[model samples]
Target: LGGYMLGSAMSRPIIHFGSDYEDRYYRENMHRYPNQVYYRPMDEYSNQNNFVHDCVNITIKQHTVTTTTKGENFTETDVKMMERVVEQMCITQYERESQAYYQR
Candidate 1:
Protein backbone atom coordinates (compact mmCIF):
# COMPACT_ATOMS: atom_id res chain seq x y z
CA LEU A 1 0.00 0.00 0.00
CA GLY A 2 2.92 2.31 0.66
CA GLY A 3 3.74 2.53 -3.02
CA TYR A 4 4.47 6.19 -3.73
CA MET A 5 7.71 7.51 -2.30
CA LEU A 6 8.48 4.04 -0.95
CA GLY A 7 8.36 2.54 -4.43
CA SER A 8 10.39 5.30 -6.02
CA ALA A 9 13.12 5.05 -3.41
CA MET A 10 13.36 1.23 -3.18
CA SER A 11 11.82 -0.33 -6.31
CA ARG A 12 15.14 -0.23 -8.20
CA PRO A 13 17.53 -1.86 -5.71
CA ILE A 14 19.68 -4.69 -7.02
CA ILE A 15 19.57 -8.25 -5.67
CA HIS A 16 22.52 -10.63 -5.57
CA PHE A 17 23.04 -14.08 -4.11
CA GLY A 18 23.25 -12.74 -0.58
CA SER A 19 22.75 -9.12 0.35
CA ASP A 20 20.88 -7.20 3.00
CA TYR A 21 18.50 -4.30 2.29
CA GLU A 22 18.12 -1.35 4.57
CA ASP A 23 14.36 -1.38 3.99
CA ARG A 24 12.41 -4.37 5.23
CA TYR A 25 9.77 -4.13 2.51
CA TYR A 26 12.41 -3.81 -0.18
CA ARG A 27 14.21 -6.93 1.04
CA GLU A 28 11.07 -9.05 1.32
CA ASN A 29 9.41 -7.87 -1.90
CA MET A 30 12.23 -9.58 -3.85
CA HIS A 31 10.73 -13.06 -3.16
CA ARG A 32 13.75 -14.85 -1.61
CA TYR A 33 11.79 -17.98 -0.53
CA PRO A 34 12.46 -20.10 -3.58
CA ASN A 35 12.59 -23.41 -1.69
CA GLN A 36 10.09 -22.41 0.94
CA VAL A 37 7.32 -21.87 -1.61
CA TYR A 38 6.78 -24.47 -4.32
CA TYR A 39 4.38 -26.97 -5.82
CA ARG A 40 4.38 -30.63 -4.71
CA PRO A 41 3.07 -33.86 -6.21
CA MET A 42 -0.26 -34.95 -4.74
CA ASP A 43 -0.93 -38.41 -3.41
CA GLU A 44 -4.67 -37.98 -3.20
CA TYR A 45 -7.32 -38.83 -5.79
CA SER A 46 -6.36 -37.95 -9.31
CA ASN A 47 -6.98 -38.85 -12.94
CA GLN A 48 -4.85 -41.12 -15.14
CA ASN A 49 -2.30 -38.36 -15.55
CA ASN A 50 -1.75 -37.06 -12.06
CA PHE A 51 -1.50 -33.34 -11.58
CA VAL A 52 0.41 -31.38 -8.99
CA HIS A 53 -1.14 -29.98 -5.85
CA ASP A 54 -0.10 -26.73 -4.17
CA CYS A 55 -0.67 -25.77 -0.57
CA VAL A 56 0.19 -22.85 1.64
CA ASN A 57 -0.05 -22.29 5.35
CA ILE A 58 1.01 -19.37 7.52
CA THR A 59 1.25 -19.13 11.27
CA ILE A 60 2.56 -16.67 13.83
CA LYS A 61 3.21 -17.31 17.52
CA GLN A 62 4.15 -15.12 20.43
CA HIS A 63 6.99 -15.83 22.83
CA THR A 64 6.63 -15.54 26.57
CA VAL A 65 9.67 -13.77 28.04
CA THR A 66 8.45 -13.92 31.63
CA THR A 67 10.63 -16.72 33.00
CA THR A 68 13.43 -16.49 30.43
CA THR A 69 16.66 -15.31 32.06
CA LYS A 70 18.60 -12.60 30.25
CA GLY A 71 22.01 -12.69 31.82
CA GLU A 72 23.77 -9.27 31.82
CA ASN A 73 23.16 -8.76 28.10
CA PHE A 74 19.96 -6.90 27.24
CA THR A 75 20.47 -7.33 23.54
CA GLU A 76 18.28 -10.43 23.67
CA THR A 77 15.24 -8.20 23.49
CA ASP A 78 16.68 -6.45 20.48
CA VAL A 79 17.39 -9.84 18.91
CA LYS A 80 13.80 -10.91 19.46
CA MET A 81 12.56 -7.61 18.05
CA MET A 82 14.62 -8.13 14.94
CA GLU A 83 13.33 -11.71 14.66
CA ARG A 84 9.74 -10.53 14.97
CA VAL A 85 10.24 -8.00 12.21
CA VAL A 86 11.78 -10.68 10.02
CA GLU A 87 8.85 -12.95 10.80
CA GLN A 88 6.37 -10.30 9.66
CA MET A 89 8.31 -9.61 6.47
CA CYS A 90 8.48 -13.34 5.73
CA ILE A 91 4.77 -13.71 6.26
CA THR A 92 4.03 -10.83 3.94
CA GLN A 93 6.23 -12.27 1.22
CA TYR A 94 4.75 -15.70 1.64
CA GLU A 95 1.22 -14.39 1.29
CA ARG A 96 2.12 -12.38 -1.77
CA GLU A 97 3.71 -15.42 -3.39
CA SER A 98 0.81 -17.61 -2.40
CA GLN A 99 -1.59 -15.26 -4.11
CA ALA A 100 0.58 -15.27 -7.21
CA TYR A 101 0.59 -19.05 -7.24
CA TYR A 102 -3.18 -19.19 -6.92
CA GLN A 103 -3.58 -16.72 -9.75
CA ARG A 104 -1.69 -19.04 -12.09
Candidate 2:
Protein backbone atom coordinates (compact mmCIF):
# COMPACT_ATOMS: atom_id res chain seq x y z
CA LEU A 1 0.00 0.00 0.00
CA GLY A 2 3.07 2.33 0.04
CA GLY A 3 2.95 2.89 -3.73
CA TYR A 4 0.43 5.76 -3.49
CA MET A 5 1.92 8.66 -5.45
CA LEU A 6 -0.26 11.76 -5.63
CA GLY A 7 0.23 15.58 -5.86
CA SER A 8 3.99 16.61 -5.84
CA ALA A 9 4.95 13.43 -3.98
CA MET A 10 5.69 11.66 -7.28
CA SER A 11 8.90 13.73 -7.72
CA ARG A 12 12.24 12.05 -7.11
CA PRO A 13 14.32 13.02 -4.08
CA ILE A 14 17.26 15.45 -4.50
CA ILE A 15 20.47 13.71 -5.59
CA HIS A 16 22.85 16.40 -4.32
CA PHE A 17 26.00 14.66 -3.15
CA GLY A 18 28.07 16.99 -1.03
CA SER A 19 30.29 17.40 2.05
CA ASP A 20 28.73 20.62 3.34
CA TYR A 21 27.74 19.04 6.64
CA GLU A 22 31.16 17.49 7.18
CA ASP A 23 32.84 20.76 6.15
CA ARG A 24 30.78 22.75 8.65
CA TYR A 25 31.18 20.08 11.32
CA TYR A 26 34.96 20.19 11.13
CA ARG A 27 35.10 23.99 10.94
CA GLU A 28 32.55 24.56 13.71
CA ASN A 29 33.79 21.87 16.06
CA MET A 30 37.51 21.96 15.23
CA HIS A 31 38.35 21.95 18.96
CA ARG A 32 35.93 19.06 19.49
CA TYR A 33 38.16 16.99 17.20
CA PRO A 34 40.96 17.18 19.78
CA ASN A 35 38.45 16.47 22.57
CA GLN A 36 37.50 13.36 20.62
CA VAL A 37 41.19 12.56 20.20
CA TYR A 38 43.06 10.71 22.99
CA TYR A 39 46.68 10.38 22.00
CA ARG A 40 49.51 12.77 22.90
CA PRO A 41 52.83 13.60 21.21
CA MET A 42 55.79 11.43 22.22
CA ASP A 43 59.28 10.64 20.93
CA GLU A 44 58.28 7.23 19.56
CA TYR A 45 55.08 5.32 18.81
CA SER A 46 56.05 2.34 16.62
CA ASN A 47 54.66 3.55 13.27
CA GLN A 48 55.37 7.18 14.13
CA ASN A 49 58.72 8.57 15.22
CA ASN A 50 60.26 12.00 15.79
CA PHE A 51 62.40 11.76 12.67
CA VAL A 52 61.91 15.49 11.98
CA HIS A 53 63.55 16.48 15.23
CA ASP A 54 66.05 13.72 14.58
CA CYS A 55 67.09 15.69 11.49
CA VAL A 56 67.07 18.84 13.57
CA ASN A 57 69.42 17.26 16.07
CA ILE A 58 71.60 15.92 13.27
CA THR A 59 71.81 19.37 11.67
CA ILE A 60 72.70 21.11 14.89
CA LYS A 61 75.05 18.33 16.00
CA GLN A 62 76.92 18.32 12.70
CA HIS A 63 77.00 22.09 12.59
CA THR A 64 78.55 22.14 16.02
CA VAL A 65 80.98 19.35 15.15
CA THR A 66 82.00 20.70 11.75
CA THR A 67 83.20 24.15 12.80
CA THR A 68 86.59 23.40 11.23
CA THR A 69 85.08 22.42 7.83
CA LYS A 70 82.30 25.00 8.12
CA GLY A 71 82.86 28.22 6.21
CA GLU A 72 80.63 31.27 6.66
CA ASN A 73 77.39 29.27 7.07
CA PHE A 74 75.20 26.63 5.37
CA THR A 75 75.40 26.41 1.55
CA GLU A 76 72.97 25.14 -1.13
CA THR A 77 74.81 21.81 -1.10
CA ASP A 78 74.37 21.63 2.68
CA VAL A 79 70.65 22.33 2.27
CA LYS A 80 70.35 19.63 -0.38
CA MET A 81 72.23 17.15 1.79
CA MET A 82 70.01 17.95 4.81
CA GLU A 83 66.83 17.55 2.76
CA ARG A 84 68.03 14.23 1.33
CA VAL A 85 68.91 13.03 4.80
CA VAL A 86 65.43 13.89 6.08
CA GLU A 87 63.79 12.11 3.12
CA GLN A 88 65.94 9.00 3.68
CA MET A 89 65.28 9.05 7.42
CA CYS A 90 61.51 9.27 6.95
CA ILE A 91 61.41 6.40 4.41
CA THR A 92 63.74 4.31 6.57
CA GLN A 93 61.58 4.83 9.63
CA TYR A 94 58.44 3.95 7.64
CA GLU A 95 60.06 0.78 6.28
CA ARG A 96 61.32 -0.16 9.75
CA GLU A 97 57.83 0.26 11.22
CA SER A 98 56.34 -1.63 8.28
CA GLN A 99 58.75 -4.49 9.00
CA ALA A 100 57.79 -4.34 12.66
CA TYR A 101 54.13 -4.71 11.66
CA TYR A 102 55.09 -7.57 9.36
CA GLN A 103 56.94 -9.33 12.20
CA ARG A 104 54.13 -8.59 14.62
Candidate 3:
Protein backbone atom coordinates (compact mmCIF):
# COMPACT_ATOMS: atom_id res chain seq x y z
CA LEU A 1 0.00 0.00 0.00
CA GLY A 2 2.82 2.38 0.81
CA GLY A 3 4.54 1.76 -2.50
CA TYR A 4 1.29 2.07 -4.37
CA MET A 5 0.52 5.37 -2.73
CA LEU A 6 4.04 6.66 -3.20
CA GLY A 7 4.11 5.67 -6.85
CA SER A 8 0.77 7.35 -7.50
CA ALA A 9 1.92 10.47 -5.72
CA MET A 10 5.10 10.48 -7.77
CA SER A 11 3.27 10.10 -11.09
CA ARG A 12 1.03 13.09 -10.47
CA PRO A 13 3.59 15.68 -11.47
CA ILE A 14 4.41 13.86 -14.66
CA ILE A 15 0.73 13.84 -15.42
CA HIS A 16 0.43 17.52 -14.60
CA PHE A 17 3.39 18.59 -16.69
CA GLY A 18 2.20 16.63 -19.69
CA SER A 19 -1.35 17.83 -19.19
CA ASP A 20 -3.03 21.11 -20.12
CA TYR A 21 -5.12 23.35 -17.86
CA GLU A 22 -8.27 21.34 -18.48
CA ASP A 23 -6.48 18.14 -17.67
CA ARG A 24 -5.11 19.63 -14.49
CA TYR A 25 -8.60 20.68 -13.42
CA TYR A 26 -9.99 17.22 -14.02
CA ARG A 27 -7.09 15.51 -12.27
CA GLU A 28 -7.22 17.81 -9.25
CA ASN A 29 -10.94 18.29 -8.73
CA MET A 30 -12.53 15.24 -10.21
CA HIS A 31 -9.91 12.51 -10.48
CA ARG A 32 -9.85 11.46 -6.85
CA TYR A 33 -12.90 12.41 -4.95
CA PRO A 34 -15.20 10.81 -2.37
CA ASN A 35 -13.17 7.83 -3.59
CA GLN A 36 -10.46 8.52 -0.98
CA VAL A 37 -8.35 5.61 -2.19
CA TYR A 38 -5.18 7.46 -3.25
CA TYR A 39 -4.89 9.78 -0.26
CA ARG A 40 -3.25 8.39 2.84
CA PRO A 41 -4.16 9.87 6.22
CA MET A 42 -7.47 10.29 4.51
CA ASP A 43 -8.88 12.71 7.05
CA GLU A 44 -6.08 15.18 6.43
CA TYR A 45 -6.33 15.21 2.68
CA SER A 46 -6.14 18.56 0.93
CA ASN A 47 -5.14 20.19 -2.31
CA GLN A 48 -1.97 21.43 -0.65
CA ASN A 49 -0.65 17.90 -0.54
CA ASN A 50 -1.64 17.41 -4.12
CA PHE A 51 0.15 20.60 -5.13
CA VAL A 52 3.28 19.67 -3.25
CA HIS A 53 3.35 16.28 -4.89
CA ASP A 54 2.96 17.86 -8.26
CA CYS A 55 5.73 20.35 -7.62
CA VAL A 56 8.12 17.66 -6.48
CA ASN A 57 7.30 15.52 -9.47
CA ILE A 58 7.75 18.47 -11.76
CA THR A 59 11.20 19.09 -10.33
CA ILE A 60 12.09 15.46 -10.94
CA LYS A 61 10.82 15.61 -14.49
CA GLN A 62 12.76 18.82 -15.08
CA HIS A 63 15.95 16.99 -14.27
CA THR A 64 15.12 14.45 -16.96
CA VAL A 65 14.45 17.25 -19.42
CA THR A 66 17.81 18.75 -18.56
CA THR A 67 19.52 15.44 -19.11
CA THR A 68 17.85 14.95 -22.46
CA THR A 69 18.80 18.44 -23.55
CA LYS A 70 22.38 17.93 -22.54
CA GLY A 71 22.53 14.57 -24.25
CA GLU A 72 21.24 15.93 -27.52
CA ASN A 73 23.59 18.88 -27.41
CA PHE A 74 20.43 20.95 -27.75
CA THR A 75 20.89 24.50 -28.90
CA GLU A 76 20.28 27.48 -26.63
CA THR A 77 16.94 27.99 -28.34
CA ASP A 78 15.85 24.46 -27.59
CA VAL A 79 16.93 24.73 -23.98
CA LYS A 80 14.96 27.95 -23.60
CA MET A 81 11.87 26.26 -24.97
CA MET A 82 12.28 23.40 -22.52
CA GLU A 83 12.54 25.87 -19.69
CA ARG A 84 9.40 27.65 -20.82
CA VAL A 85 7.59 24.33 -21.02
CA VAL A 86 8.57 23.48 -17.47
CA GLU A 87 7.54 26.92 -16.19
CA GLN A 88 4.16 26.80 -17.88
CA MET A 89 3.63 23.26 -16.63
CA CYS A 90 4.22 24.35 -13.03
CA ILE A 91 2.07 27.46 -13.32
CA THR A 92 -0.88 25.56 -14.67
CA GLN A 93 -0.50 22.90 -11.99
CA TYR A 94 -0.51 25.45 -9.17
CA GLU A 95 -3.42 27.35 -10.63
CA ARG A 96 -5.55 24.23 -10.87
CA GLU A 97 -4.65 23.11 -7.39
CA SER A 98 -5.50 26.53 -6.01
CA GLN A 99 -8.81 26.56 -7.76
CA ALA A 100 -9.69 23.11 -6.43
CA TYR A 101 -8.89 24.13 -2.86
CA TYR A 102 -11.01 27.27 -3.10
CA GLN A 103 -13.91 25.38 -4.57
CA ARG A 104 -13.77 22.84 -1.76
Candidate 4:
Protein backbone atom coordinates (compact mmCIF):
# COMPACT_ATOMS: atom_id res chain seq x y z
CA LEU A 1 0.00 0.00 0.00
CA GLY A 2 2.30 2.75 1.26
CA GLY A 3 5.33 1.00 -0.13
CA TYR A 4 5.26 3.32 -3.15
CA MET A 5 5.54 6.29 -0.80
CA LEU A 6 9.16 5.54 -0.11
CA GLY A 7 12.16 6.70 -2.13
CA SER A 8 11.85 3.75 -4.49
CA ALA A 9 8.29 4.68 -5.34
CA MET A 10 7.44 5.31 -8.97
CA SER A 11 6.32 8.85 -9.46
CA ARG A 12 2.59 9.32 -9.77
CA PRO A 13 1.47 10.45 -13.21
CA ILE A 14 -0.94 13.33 -12.99
CA ILE A 15 -2.29 15.95 -15.33
CA HIS A 16 -1.91 18.96 -13.04
CA PHE A 17 -0.35 17.82 -9.75
CA GLY A 18 2.56 15.52 -8.97
CA SER A 19 4.54 13.84 -6.23
CA ASP A 20 7.54 15.50 -4.57
CA TYR A 21 9.81 13.44 -6.75
CA GLU A 22 8.06 14.80 -9.81
CA ASP A 23 8.32 18.41 -8.64
CA ARG A 24 12.05 17.88 -8.22
CA TYR A 25 12.83 15.80 -11.28
CA TYR A 26 10.42 17.38 -13.74
CA ARG A 27 9.97 20.99 -12.68
CA GLU A 28 13.18 21.67 -10.73
CA ASN A 29 15.73 19.56 -12.56
CA MET A 30 16.14 19.80 -16.32
CA HIS A 31 17.92 16.84 -17.86
CA ARG A 32 16.24 14.54 -15.34
CA TYR A 33 12.86 15.19 -16.98
CA PRO A 34 13.27 12.09 -19.11
CA ASN A 35 13.41 11.45 -22.89
CA GLN A 36 14.90 14.18 -25.16
CA VAL A 37 13.53 16.87 -22.86
CA TYR A 38 16.98 18.32 -22.16
CA TYR A 39 17.34 19.07 -25.88
CA ARG A 40 14.52 21.63 -25.72
CA PRO A 41 14.38 24.82 -23.73
CA MET A 42 10.98 24.22 -22.21
CA ASP A 43 7.80 22.17 -22.19
CA GLU A 44 5.23 23.97 -24.36
CA TYR A 45 2.17 21.79 -23.98
CA SER A 46 1.02 24.53 -21.57
CA ASN A 47 0.84 27.09 -24.41
CA GLN A 48 -0.11 25.03 -27.41
CA ASN A 49 -3.60 26.37 -28.16
CA ASN A 50 -7.03 27.11 -26.77
CA PHE A 51 -10.20 29.08 -27.59
CA VAL A 52 -8.40 32.31 -26.68
CA HIS A 53 -6.08 31.98 -29.64
CA ASP A 54 -9.07 31.61 -31.93
CA CYS A 55 -10.82 34.55 -30.35
CA VAL A 56 -7.73 36.73 -30.66
CA ASN A 57 -7.33 35.83 -34.30
CA ILE A 58 -10.92 36.76 -34.88
CA THR A 59 -10.57 39.97 -32.93
CA ILE A 60 -7.51 40.93 -34.97
CA LYS A 61 -9.48 40.33 -38.15
CA GLN A 62 -12.67 41.86 -36.86
CA HIS A 63 -12.50 44.46 -39.61
CA THR A 64 -12.49 41.79 -42.31
CA VAL A 65 -14.86 39.50 -40.45
CA THR A 66 -17.31 39.53 -37.55
CA THR A 67 -16.40 38.71 -33.95
CA THR A 68 -19.69 37.01 -33.33
CA THR A 69 -19.88 33.40 -32.25
CA LYS A 70 -23.59 33.94 -31.68
CA GLY A 71 -24.78 32.82 -35.06
CA GLU A 72 -28.32 31.44 -35.48
CA ASN A 73 -27.82 28.79 -32.80
CA PHE A 74 -27.27 31.03 -29.78
CA THR A 75 -26.88 34.59 -28.61
CA GLU A 76 -25.87 35.86 -25.16
CA THR A 77 -23.26 37.77 -23.16
CA ASP A 78 -20.68 35.07 -23.86
CA VAL A 79 -18.37 36.42 -21.18
CA LYS A 80 -16.03 33.47 -21.60
CA MET A 81 -15.68 34.12 -25.31
CA MET A 82 -15.10 37.80 -24.71
CA GLU A 83 -12.56 36.92 -22.04
CA ARG A 84 -10.80 34.66 -24.52
CA VAL A 85 -10.56 37.54 -26.96
CA VAL A 86 -9.19 39.76 -24.24
CA GLU A 87 -6.72 37.09 -23.18
CA GLN A 88 -5.50 36.67 -26.72
CA MET A 89 -5.24 40.38 -27.42
CA CYS A 90 -4.07 41.51 -24.01
CA ILE A 91 -1.88 38.67 -22.73
CA THR A 92 -1.22 35.90 -25.23
CA GLN A 93 -0.43 38.51 -27.87
CA TYR A 94 2.56 39.73 -25.90
CA GLU A 95 3.68 36.26 -24.86
CA ARG A 96 3.06 34.47 -28.18
CA GLU A 97 2.23 36.86 -30.97
CA SER A 98 4.90 35.59 -33.36
CA GLN A 99 6.50 32.26 -34.15
CA ALA A 100 9.86 33.98 -34.64
CA TYR A 101 9.68 35.19 -31.05
CA TYR A 102 8.76 31.70 -29.92
CA GLN A 103 11.81 30.12 -31.55
CA ARG A 104 14.01 32.59 -29.73
Top-lDDT candidate index = 3
User: After superposing candidate 4, which stretches have Cα over 4 Å from the reference?
Assistant: 1-74, 85-90, 97-104
Local distance difference test, candidate 3: 0.41
List, residue by residue over 9-60, the lDDT tens digit for candidate 3.
Answer: 2122233434376445434543421111122222343464464464444453
Model 1 scores a C-alpha lDDT of 0.31
For residue 44, give model 1's deviation from the true position in Å. 15
Worst 10 residues of 2 by lDDT: 4-13
Clashing pairs in 2: none
TM-score of each: 0.30, 0.30, 0.33, 0.21
lDDT of 2 by residue, 1-104 (tens): 12311111111112111455633433452231111101222325444344444433444344434643755454553343333334444444345445656785
Residue-pair clashes, model 1: 0
Displacement of residue 93 (Cα, Å) in model 4 is: 2.8
* Model 2: lDDT of residue 87: 40
Error of 4 at 16 (Å): 15
lDDT of each: 0.31, 0.36, 0.41, 0.32
